[PDB]
Write a protein that binds this ligand. Structure first.
Ligand SMILES: Cn1cnc(Nc2ccc(CCN)cc2)c(Cl)c1=O
Length: 121
């Protein structure tokens, strides 16, 4: 679709980055975002960094958004998707972390669809 190819192909502008920061800020303020605000503490999960290849967290993405790290929206979505995929990979489905990744990813998808619609019209 128009938004699909534009997500893959259209380079991010300074205007887009205003939308990326807003989406991220709305995630950081969500009540179920508490496990993803900062990197996982390895004292809380000893084997986490031995099994998770590419860890990710909202503070790392905030730094990358600040430094204009992302060139395409797909790269931004890929980093965010890693946060939730890493969580559901390491934790059981009845874990509070797992449940948070399910709620927050749905919330992110709602906000991402709003951002994609604002770039095209
Ligand atoms: C297994 N596992 C553990 N903790 C997670 N988040 C998280 C990050 C930081 C803090 C407090 C910071 N000292 C608490 C929880 C995730 Cl996401 C996870 O999967």
């Amino acid at each position: 679709s128009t938004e699909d190819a534009m997500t893959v192909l259209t380079p991010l502008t300074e205007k887009d980055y205003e939308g990326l920061k807003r989406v991220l800020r709305s995630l950081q303020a969500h009540k179920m975002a508490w496990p993803f605000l900062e990197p996982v503490d390895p004292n809380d999960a000893p084997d986490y960094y031995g099994v998770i290849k590419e860890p990710m967290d909202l503070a790392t993405m905030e730094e990358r958004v600040q430094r204009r790290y992302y060139e395409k929206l797909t790269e931004f979505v890929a980093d965010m998707t890693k946060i939730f995929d890493n969580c559901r990979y390491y934790n059981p489905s009845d874990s509070p972390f797992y449940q948070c990744a399910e709620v927050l990813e749905s919330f992110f998808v709602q906000k991402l669809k709003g951002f994609k619609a604002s770039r095209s019209h």
